[PDB]
Design a protein around this ligand. Structure first.
Ligand SMILES: [Zn+2]
Length: 134
């Protein structure tokens, strides 16, 4: 930047992960696993476009099919409202892929992920009232 062009000797490289400051308030995180296909699915939703998902990251590998489900749910919940991301349920994405039932375990994780991320995002919203007790 600026005329002077002899400084900067490391190339603008990124030094963060998939979250801004883990301060929540706009970043639902969810990491589930499926002991069946020994596959860990880590989803990451980001809200900022006015409560809308400004972006969404994914990360899963192990099964011989889920590696694709991440591409769908990712290209379907990007820039949309949480009202649509927290509704696709698992039976919907499954019908979009059309895969055997005994193999719907991966789809369940995908859905359980969008729900865990939203639930974790609202956990830091302030909707808590008198912690339950028993
Ligand atoms: Zn699987």
């Amino acid at each position: 930047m600026a005329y002077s062009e002899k400084v900067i000797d490391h190339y603008e490289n990124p030094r963060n992960v998939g979250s801004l400051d883990k301060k929540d308030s706009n970043v639902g995180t969810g990491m589930v696993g499926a002991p069946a296909c020994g596959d860990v699915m880590q989803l990451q939703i980001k809200v900022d476009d006015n409560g809308i998902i400004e972006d969404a990251k994914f990360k899963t590998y192990g099964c011989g099919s889920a590696i694709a489900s991440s591409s769908l749910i990712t290209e379907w919940v990007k820039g949309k409202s949480l009202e649509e991301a927290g509704a696709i349920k698992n039976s919907q994405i499954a019908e979009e892929l059309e895969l055997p039932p005994v193999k719907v375990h991966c789809s369940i994780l995908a859905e359980d992920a969008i729900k865990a991320a939203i639930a974790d995002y609202k956990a830091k919203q302030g909707l808590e009232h008198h912690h339950h007790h028993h």
